[PDB]
Point group: D2
Chain length 494, copies 4
Amino acid sequence: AVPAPNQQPEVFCNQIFINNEWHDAVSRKTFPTVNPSTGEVICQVAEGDKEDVDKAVKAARAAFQLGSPWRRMDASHRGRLLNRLADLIERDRTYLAALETLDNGKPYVISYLVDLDMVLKCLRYYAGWADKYHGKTIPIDGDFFSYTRHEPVGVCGQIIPWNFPLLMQAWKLGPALATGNVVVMKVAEQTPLTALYVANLIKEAGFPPGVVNIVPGFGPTAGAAIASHEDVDKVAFTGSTEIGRVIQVAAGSSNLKRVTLELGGKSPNIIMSDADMDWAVEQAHFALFFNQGQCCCAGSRTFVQEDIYDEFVERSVARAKSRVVGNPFDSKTEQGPQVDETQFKKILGYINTGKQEGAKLLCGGGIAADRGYFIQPTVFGDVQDGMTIAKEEIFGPVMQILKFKTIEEVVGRANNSTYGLAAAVFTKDLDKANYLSQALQAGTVWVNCYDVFGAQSPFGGYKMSGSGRELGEYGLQAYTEVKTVTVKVPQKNS
Amino acid sequence: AVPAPNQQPEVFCNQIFINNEWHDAVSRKTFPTVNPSTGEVICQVAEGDKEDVDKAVKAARAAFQLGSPWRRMDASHRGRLLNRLADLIERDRTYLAALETLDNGKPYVISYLVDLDMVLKCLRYYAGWADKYHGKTIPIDGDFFSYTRHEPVGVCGQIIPWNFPLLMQAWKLGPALATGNVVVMKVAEQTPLTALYVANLIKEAGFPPGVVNIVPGFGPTAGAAIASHEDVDKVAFTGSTEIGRVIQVAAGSSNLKRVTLELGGKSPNIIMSDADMDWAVEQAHFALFFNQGQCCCAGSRTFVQEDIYDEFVERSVARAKSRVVGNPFDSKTEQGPQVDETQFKKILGYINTGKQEGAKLLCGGGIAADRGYFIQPTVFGDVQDGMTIAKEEIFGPVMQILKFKTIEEVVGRANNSTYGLAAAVFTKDLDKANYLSQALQAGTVWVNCYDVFGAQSPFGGYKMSGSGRELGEYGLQAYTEVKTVTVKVPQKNS
Amino acid sequence: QAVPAPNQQPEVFCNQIFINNEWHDAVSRKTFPTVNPSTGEVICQVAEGDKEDVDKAVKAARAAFQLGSPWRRMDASHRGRLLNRLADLIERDRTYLAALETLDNGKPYVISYLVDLDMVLKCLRYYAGWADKYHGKTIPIDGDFFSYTRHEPVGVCGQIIPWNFPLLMQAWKLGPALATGNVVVMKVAEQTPLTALYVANLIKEAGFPPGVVNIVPGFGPTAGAAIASHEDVDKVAFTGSTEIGRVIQVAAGSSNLKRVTLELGGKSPNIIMSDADMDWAVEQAHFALFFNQGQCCCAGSRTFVQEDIYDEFVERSVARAKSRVVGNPFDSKTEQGPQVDETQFKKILGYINTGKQEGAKLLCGGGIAADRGYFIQPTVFGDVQDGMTIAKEEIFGPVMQILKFKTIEEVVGRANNSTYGLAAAVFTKDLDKANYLSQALQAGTVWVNCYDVFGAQSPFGGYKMSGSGRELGEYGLQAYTEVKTVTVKVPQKNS
Amino acid sequence: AVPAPNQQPEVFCNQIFINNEWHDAVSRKTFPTVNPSTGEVICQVAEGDKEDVDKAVKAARAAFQLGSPWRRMDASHRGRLLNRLADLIERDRTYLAALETLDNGKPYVISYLVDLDMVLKCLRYYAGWADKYHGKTIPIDGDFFSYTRHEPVGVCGQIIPWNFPLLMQAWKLGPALATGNVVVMKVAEQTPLTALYVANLIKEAGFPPGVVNIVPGFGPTAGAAIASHEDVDKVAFTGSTEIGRVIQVAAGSSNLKRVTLELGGKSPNIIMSDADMDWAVEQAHFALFFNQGQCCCAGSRTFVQEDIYDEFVERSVARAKSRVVGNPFDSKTEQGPQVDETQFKKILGYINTGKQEGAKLLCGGGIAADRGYFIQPTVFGDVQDGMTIAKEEIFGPVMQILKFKTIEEVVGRANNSTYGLAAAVFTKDLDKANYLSQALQAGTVWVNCYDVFGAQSPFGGYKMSGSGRELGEYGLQAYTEVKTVTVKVPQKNS
Ligand SMILES: NC(=O)c1ccc[n+]([C@@H]2O[C@H](COP(=O)([O-])OP(=O)(O)OC[C@H]3O[C@@H](n4cnc5c(N)ncnc54)[C@H](O)[C@@H]3O)[C@@H](O)[C@H]2O)c1
Ligand SMILES: [Mg+2]
Ligand SMILES: [Mg+2]
Ligand SMILES: [Mg+2]
Ligand SMILES: [Mg+2]
Ligand code: NA
Ligand code: NA
Ligand code: NA
Ligand code: NA
């Protein structure tokens, strides 16, 4: 039971957040953020650039100074603050969910039940890690006492995308704050609003000034300034593989700041002939169409064994044809519009390429509404590995169904990609499941399920889908700088 | 008790090692490797370039294929192989120590008692880790069974320096092989001999073909080919900060391969007025002059509290003057020549800058011999923070002694650097020791000691001294790719 | 810092047996009185649980632990949510619980409020974070197999606690147990059952499924022994005397081989080196001994002082002991309340006479401090020798022992020459002396330049006969986990 | 292929091992050890009692004193010593395998290929743990620095059984010595020889005097003296559930020494209808009959689904009838004699009980030879849960086959036992495998296999099958005493 939404939530925050205060861009410039459902401007937002990032980094560095309130704060207390932040977010859950839908386009029911829930679970999970990421006492040779201190990496630049505005912010802040780091976050220009409101909650929660600084703005400007900053110790980025390369280059070209990347993919969803048909069809649908197809780990390569190909395709088409597209604020809406005009056009371009290359168009393929950025649920059959839609990340409601014969064959085809974010296996057989999960070159391998995320379980990509992991205990690794202290002792004993 | 060395050890390996076989460079080109003590050529060595690296990567990739001998091998057996390799290196200890000295220049007594001992301890330590780096079973929400597999990152490109040829090879091979990875190693052009002989021992130990491949050659050629290779999954580099930046940029500009760096420093060695004078003086001497001053973590900024400054300096100068420079094969030799002419000239250049800038030359200052790359143990007193010799890594037998008054002052001065590899504190006071070890922004802080390395304790730098850590359990992190497997289960129970 | 005014006569709302989130009278309908140690008067009667009541509690716990039950299926993260909720409810009723603790126990209200309750909240909140983080392992075993371990709950946990820290001991037990999905049958101390029973009401209010936590107030040889000997209790955690510790382990072995962890007493040495900060060491040595009316398991009951500073250290310690305010625990000026009961009161008086009889120099106190209640004067014995009974046995009262020593090698030997090894401390400014001593001392916790510094993050437990196993920190989860290895045959094992 | 065995290996050690020396019992008494294949006395062995244990404990205590050679020894060197012992054991493998067979009765081929191999793997695995079991640095509240030291528990009393003499000794010594503890081992009166010979190797390997002391003798005498000793810090026992209780009572009655127990069981081996018939039959045979049925985790309750019951039974009887029983030194022998006359008669008694209670005798059931303790491979069909042979541990070549219908039924019947050491599931279905592995109350659950031991994976029982775990990292826990050191610092920072 979801509370009735305010289909027109008021915007209270639209500036640059530094030292728990709101500031206009030094240039005084602003940029519009659009409601993808109507194509209308919601409001103006401060356009942060290099100079604003500089102010943000200085504030973060000051908050990270030895002896500061944030540095002296008990680890357990950082946990207390993260829990308080989660409580505040829960209080304002109905509002944030509506605002998320307004600025992003995803169905309100999904914003409320899925996104906001995961945000709360991520923040509360990491709050528990605050005073538990122990260093080590080491039995080194000789008369010495050796141990390690798990110190904060320092000033962390965090650049996030627009597909899960609130969630991406939580996946970043959770681990960083739990370990005592300070943040300079650059939210996506397409979805800056919700993250900015949470900044107000961060101040209300009690976090010292400068611990979390948010700079809304464009990528080549604000984003690059963070990645190239001489005083940013670490950068965490989630987005396109293309910009991931730019980030890494900027890091190497500047102060050698530590880097972790969460990029895209072309994840293979493998359906074996012994899989539960009804379950696999529904899960394959969800795997691809979830969040308007705007998911990094989307099951965009649906491999189906020949014996069950026809039936699976028929059922998948029927499911795609009945998928409700419309106003994200209407409870019956399963799919809202795409984030912006650029994505809208790019997706339509991919559908055209799909038709041109010989992929069999089974349903959809065009615009779903005359207003907004709505696209019809599209399904392509008889897709070949060499096809563009079978290789490139579409990031829209466009499903690819491929046919295979043997298990050995599908492993090779699934792995024949520059991406490796995720994969899935649908089978009732124990050996097939273990054979495939071990063989698949992907960060996450789901068996008889898809898009199952847990704050306890790490997520990240193999190959060019990224480096490093987020969520779980692993999510703390990149936010820790290790110091070894080796002390001479009179006489070491076991 | 050190066995009498063969002052002219025969060279058996001087080619490119691929698939457990010796090959000439595709171009058939060779480069000379010089004996720094005499300036004479030892022998010619195959000059590996891009085409040779390509062959090496393909061999490594083949050896890493699923179902291959190396992939199927029990983790405990990889441990058995590492132990076997250690035994073979111990069998040929006297020979390797002599060859190390011949090619590098360091005293034979040191090569035998220190370098070789550390190589053996490193390999035997990692041998034990082979079957103990567990993944995790995670209590994720919902009806799921979630766990992680700690798989090998893959084809690892390993680029190492010339200061500790065998030890650097060990620090790289140990963690990589322990975790089931395959290697393409680029040894330093100044010291390729000892590493090539070890390749023979790797074959003798029983490691499958392609598991370890070694390509001797230059940096911009062979090294850059590895860093930019589209099929290399991870690169580990040890060397200058300048080239470290080049490596990270190459990785980002290519296939987003994972990166870890071990660069230089300008490590501060702080002597508080309550320190044991005799011990502090001897340790500070060792901290700087060890291995001809060619140590990444050399104590190149000796901070001495004003009350004991004069006495400390007087004793330091006396010790530097008594240091025996000469033939590394002579038991009485404490300091051999610098690695090559380039380093020789660079050091003399820094000494000149020290004189030009007003630092007080207290002893040494020039060449120590008319043949070979020998430099006199040099000590500069009254060094100021703004001086070139106080900021840049000299990598030679040139000591800088600075004066300070308060503990608060020295912390700021010690940390005022783009480097942060190591640091040391000499004091008898508990509080001062804890205050300093916590406040110093350095990868390793030594208290009442220096250059105390243990295979069990991690080593790495803060800031621009590098990223990631080697040695200890931490050394396994960069050689692991994490995979999450999440399986739907009938009903999850605790 | 600031403390809300206490209700010096807090109303008692819970005084029965807690099973399946409901209150029950003992099957026998028997009740026992709990006394206010400050006045010696009866506060109220409490249901007297016995074997038959324990059996019911164990059966309820077993049912709550059945596969498919709400508590077994509950997401680990949610168990953490429930623990945080319980902590919030305890904080809401902090002032009430602080006063009730003082009424039943006797400790100063200011301490119950600022110390005990604070530590309770911190313990529960720490463990809530552990709920979904105590991972099992995936193991690189030889051959074509996939091997891993599940960290399952040990099962029905019997927890028997003492009276010196009623609420805190309850929290130290519940936190790790609930965080790991176990169920509990807790036997609170007969001298202080009230606060734990009220917390049961908060456990129900928090949302814990019925049977997850069951509390049986009653005596030791009856209710406590029934838990230790129970054929369906999988694990027992006990805190109290070394003697009952042995009885518990024997009962475990003679019954179903239930797993056992013990937190017993000690005769903890507090070593003061000649280079220590005098003022700091004196104040800390006083605290180390006299805290909680000297009723602390890890009390620094053997104060070793280096000869060169002995005279001055003693003079300052005596003056500090003489200035210690003894009186009504509800009065803000009060530093020391009464001992927990008449039995302890008499036992301490006996040890004081024992000290005088064996030759220890009585420096101050040594008698009854008040006509009513169980108040004892802060007592200090000087020139104590290792062979004295007051130097060997746990007094558990406001009785300090000061011993003199010369060298660091000597003090290590004397401090370790004991059947106890719960804790120890070292006061020195020297790096080497601190490292030499912390390594050499055979104790569970070694404090350097401090004492009684507990952290929910750091393990606590004894060496030798001071106990086995550890509580608090990550280590506190070990005893509440039963490890299962699952080894599956796979087509072809690859790294 | 296995080397030719010396069918009558010379006995070199038969006394009490204390301080790396051989002693007779204080009472000068000895006891005979018998060859179970002929019933003939091999030799006399010193009968250790309380006074001998007292001498061993004092020696162990002395070796454990602070500052002793064993206490000061580098953790890494303890690993070196364990690896050396393994090497000596491997050098004398042919001899030890033959001696094991002579004293125990198990087939020489198995002693050589299985027992000795596992002994080597156990010691080599733990050798690797010596310097890797780290303590922690903890982020405690307030201005303190808190850390934990993982110290050795101290003097460890280790009492082991006769079913796997050498292996049981290795499972105890490996973890204990890896963590720096000292040992007073009490070997089984039925099989003291091999352990005593290894004591010689322990001395030859270089372990300091008193680190390992071995006292051969009886249970109520030497064993009980160890369990009740006032100066033994920890006791690890493997044997019967009955004596396990006696050990725990002794510990509680004495000095509260820490306790871990590895007892027996009545492990259920579950065969679902979709299991691989051939594989399940051979594995079920192995599961029960392995080691003359003298295995703690023997699959003595073979549950078979009704649909495949008749066929499974027919194949199981045929396999049991073909099992070769005879001279353990003959390469064709699969089953040697039982350990002694006591066990021999106990098993026959159980077989008679099985017949009286209504179980269907399908094959065997009697003595297999007129000399030695040989018993025919016996199989009972239509066994019911209430039958004595279905509840009590037989420890002989007596198989129980029960029929079941549903999965919920088999899980409940399998769990309806006071034991819970191990269990197994044979099925091709993923969900069935996961459901059973989770629901079964057993220390180890094998899936599509049985008796798969790995030094890397823990082993131990649920309920009355024991407490604590051996093998893996978990095996180190009981050998560690944890010490927390909390230090006041001037100002704590993250
Ligand atoms: N951190 C260290 O341990 C360390 C080691 C050696 C040198 N140094 C520093 O570096 C200074 C210069 O010495 P150097 O030139 O021999 O160090 P370097 O960084 O140039 O060489 C290190 C390794 O990287 C390879 N390399 C060089 N250029 C490369 C490139 N363009 N792409 C890929 N790999 C490349 C080299 O061949 C060698 O194998 C030294 O004086 C000292 O200050 C530091
Ligand atoms: Mg872009
Ligand atoms: Mg260079
Ligand atoms: Mg009592
Ligand atoms: Mg017996
Ligand atoms: Na928008
Ligand atoms: Na050279
Ligand atoms: Na009371
Ligand atoms: Na025998």
